[PDB]
């Protein structure tokens, strides 16, 4: 039981970093979403001038 | 390794991309993975490295030759995603 508890020694100090940096790496990409809007716009513009 | 080397048309692979698949295939890491899972595992591990060990990809691009440090860093970077 000592060994089973001592497996949980430095979990909290590291998982408080895990939680934060994990949700940041999830959720810091709406910039890329709004970049995708401009990318598909320029994609359509290149396509239609290719048609012209 | 047989199910590994399939490759769709119009899908060439750079040398920096081809190295880690070989390094995983030699060192038996694919053995615990399902035989059908290999195809998604390839692209998964590639996007894994391109996301993360992009420096190692540049090292393979620049050198074309793996040092022992690149070998061990490659080993760690493989066995990381081999844990999934």
């Amino acid at each position: 039981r000592i060994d089973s508890v001592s497996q949980l020694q430095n979990v909290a100090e590291t998982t408080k970093v895990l939680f934060d940096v994990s949700k940041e790496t999830v959720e810091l990409e709406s910039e890329a979403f709004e970049l995708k809007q401009k990318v598909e716009l320029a994609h359509e513009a290149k396509a239609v001038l290719d048609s012209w | 390794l047989t199910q590994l080397l399939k490759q769709n048309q119009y899908s060439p692979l750079a040398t920096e991309e081809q190295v880690p698949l070989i390094y995983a295939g030699v060192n038996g890491h694919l053995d615990g993975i399902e035989l059908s899972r290999i195809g998604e595992f390839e692209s998964s591990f590639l996007s894994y490295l391109k996301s993360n060990h992009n420096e190692l990809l540049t090292e393979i691009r620049e050198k074309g030759e793996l040092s022992k440090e690149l070998l061990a860093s490659l080993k760690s970077a493989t066995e990381s995603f081999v844990a999934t």
């Binding site: 590291t14 939680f19 940096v21 790496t25 990409e29 | 060990h53």
Partner: protein, 171 residues
Amino acid sequence: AKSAANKLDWAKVISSLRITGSTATQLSSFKKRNDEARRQLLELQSQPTEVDFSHYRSVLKNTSVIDKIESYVKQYKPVKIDASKQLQVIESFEKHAMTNAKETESLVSKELKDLQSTLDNIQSARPFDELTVDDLTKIKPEIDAKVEEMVKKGKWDVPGYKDRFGNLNVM
């Protein structure tokens, strides 16, 4: 700089071996890898998002729309701002995180030395040849309660005794 975050992620995978059956934390790593792979291919796929007015406009000698669509793109050149909307519910999630984390951390930092002291207590305080049953009634009055109730109800059988402690009688 995300390589340190993913190094910490695989450290949390080899420590999440201690918790098998994580329903959506590994799925949270899955979603962050998914949209990270999406955004890196999106930025590598991205051109300089424009129509080349020098070459690719003058390729069309019958131009007539390239000024129109070019000023249409330069019109929507302020596309849309991003979404840094969460600063109130996300801090509540990490508030519950720091709450339960420091609960766990304080409890394990107490109980580690507590059970180490329990091991040291078992180390030098085992009178396994000279302990008194009155000291057992003193350390546990539950002994006296079960003895008196075992007499008063009349279940003079002692069940589960004869297996490891044989009856050593004549018959």
